[PDB]
Amino acid sequence: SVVEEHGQLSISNGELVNERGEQVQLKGMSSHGLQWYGQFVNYESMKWLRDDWGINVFRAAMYTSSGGYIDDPSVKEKVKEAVEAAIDLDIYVIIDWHILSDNDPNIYKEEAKDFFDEMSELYGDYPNVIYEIANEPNGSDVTWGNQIKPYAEEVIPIIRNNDPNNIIIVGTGTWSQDVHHAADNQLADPNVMYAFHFYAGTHGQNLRDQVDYALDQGAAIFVSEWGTSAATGDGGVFLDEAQVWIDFMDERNLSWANWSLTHKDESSAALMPGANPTGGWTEAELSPSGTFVREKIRES
Template structure:
């Protein structure tokens, strides 16, 4: 009997166990179905990937006529919730928060848009990826008609773009003259645009911009079609020429406080406040609230062998310092300087002359001169250049500026090498020598790396700066030191997020060329200023980033209005008669001083008017 009861008990336990397993399987299957792992009615297409984005996009539609400016934009919907512009997913190195909501963009009827709508995500109908391929200007030259195009990619998808490619059809009969921030090749009759090594990835709710291409054709002809293919962490997305426009580059965006990419981080839109910065801003970012005060400079004092006189910049403002995120004079008053940069000292040494500097001081009301000494390319200081001659040019420049009672920037002009660490040892020796020679003058500013670029991170630049700055401080405890920022001194937000600590009177540079850099970069600048970052615009112009192309006075005026609002100093590029738009002197003028307005270039006349207004 006991044996039979044990057998019955064992059988019952086995049946109970099987029943439990069956019930668990049913529950598991039900949960998987509820979570969407098994396609129900209407869900099968949502799981398919787009294996042919070019076919899905279809033929790019013709761009509407916008006069001289042509725009190419399109957006798609894809999985991903995205983050707000101040969300944790915003990454340095790209302009975050530039996207608009999907409600701000009309629905599209293109093949690409319809394909995207077949793939609903957590936010159905939200915008995905936008392509702006815009004609920035054109001109006739010796080899034909030149057209310059500016390209931006905006990622609103909520998923990181890991790689991208832009195909521009109809490129037969065209030739690339120059390009920047991208790589180019041709395939048949198409131009293929691919990333540079530093802008291949585009984080969610961010953008890349500053991509430029100059194309030469025998006759005037505009490229009006383009298709973007973007690989994301969720699959492939395409965008073609479409009807949903991106925000236009319009200076009123800043002036009216409507710049979509320029959140101040405090719930207000840039432009709605005055230029006053909160006193706590610099301290909260780890930046010194008040820079060290050096010995005051008074009229009658000696300045590099000259007597400081009243009515000159140094005579009126004395020794400068950084206070509460702003440049101030020795009396604690905010001081906005207007200056002129030389071109490369090795290429246009003739403009380092006493009469040239006198003309910029007396006729232009310039406060400072910038001595641009290239460190690498074309006979640069560290690449076969005549170091002795270059240092003599620096010495003459400091002498002539001091004689006019002006301030002077000694610029280690990093450009071609990209990473300032490449010639770091030369830079350390150079600034050791310069700061020992001029550390007591009080009118010399040290710019230790002009434009880091080519994928160099702020971490790389900061490491370099933290090795160069102590060398200068050992000789000059008070002088202003300017530190460049990545991507040709544009990623000012990276420095704001992780400033250099332990030193006074440090400022960070931003460079702009008004026809290329517009409201997005202005928004980034304003946010950095409101965060308390001391910013100095040590180079700028009103043409495009190549130093050529057309002038954009509307964007240029928006820049100057913003700089005036916050008393940010700026320096015009460049004192030369080179045959390019950025040159301040007309290419047909051989004079080194006392130029009439007719002997200046259009750019020169514009900057002179700004300085003397």
């Protein structure tokens, strides 16, 4: 129903809109790294998220390093499984080239181009697909103008040769926080969005103001990852600040995916130890974070 109704997504005046020009807000879950917790990514779990949580997007977090795709490329087949499930379930799907320790997206740019060529050839005639070409550029030696923008200007044409207008999300500096510099030096492609990531354990008032600055430059922003925890993915749960961010995102038409769908014993994990990887989770099988995130999506 979601993808049939909204169909082709595009950016109009800095906003994500559907094929009839109406604003639409995606809300869903990210996997954790597919090399570690890939068992939680399957049609049945995604169907349960759709039906019981109300998700309308799923993010497949394919780490490049840390035992991910560069080390063992088999994890690309799990991305394909996720995409196929999203197509069958009629929800959107984010294909996330999940850089992190490999902090400059240029490190594995040749592999990224290859990977996005393959994915856009396979899936470029479905409206479900959103390409996230570099999760979290980071480090003081990685800037928008010097590193990230020219990386994007190599990868985007590879995608566009196969898929001329599905959404592309481009990471920003400082772990996808530096939307200000991106917004001042935007990419040409009209269906690009810039990633912004937050963690509720950080006091967020200035970060909200910087998102507003970026929006005011006509840049579109997708909150392609956020957590209820501290910035490490752990360190307690911060539901008061999370709620402030939830309300902010609703007021600004900002789509989002929460980190993450795993049973790992860290505060950002949505599931308890013993949660079934194919779904069906009782209240007792959701973590503090998962209970909250589920409520936010069901409210929506």
